[PDB]
Design a binder for this molecule. Structure first.
Ligand code: FES
Ligand code: FES
Lengths: 64, 69
């Protein structure tokens, strides 16, 4: 059972790296691999959780 | 039976109906490496578990890194 079904399948291992300096106020990152704006969350987790009974959700990196 | 759709997170914090983590950058140090495969024993941090997931399932998931320029 794969987790990522369709994103960047020509990449054998998808890793993203960002510098905190470039982030601004808040960045919300997808952990469900269903976002159409991956690596950013676009709310797709909700339908994923609904269909599957799962409980996954995003990672938020923000300024204090 | 394709009516039963596979979960992404199999085991982590199942008493939590939707797992979200929120961190302030100032608290992150030089680098933080976050799990996006839900198999790490150190979740929400990556501990290398994605490698075994990828070999077993044919997937290509990997972590998210936040660091200083
Ligand atoms: S769209 Fe994937 S965690 Fe929100
Ligand atoms: S252990 Fe999950 S992405 Fe590395």
């Amino acid at each position: 059972a794969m987790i990522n079904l369709h994103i960047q399948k020509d990449n054998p291992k998808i890793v993203h790296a960002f510098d905190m300096e470039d982030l601004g106020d808040k960045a919300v990152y997808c952990r469900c691999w269903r976002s159409k704006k991956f690596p950013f969350c676009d709310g797709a987790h909700t339908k994923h959780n609904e269909e599957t009974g799962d409980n996954v959700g995003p990672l938020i990196i923000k300024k204090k």
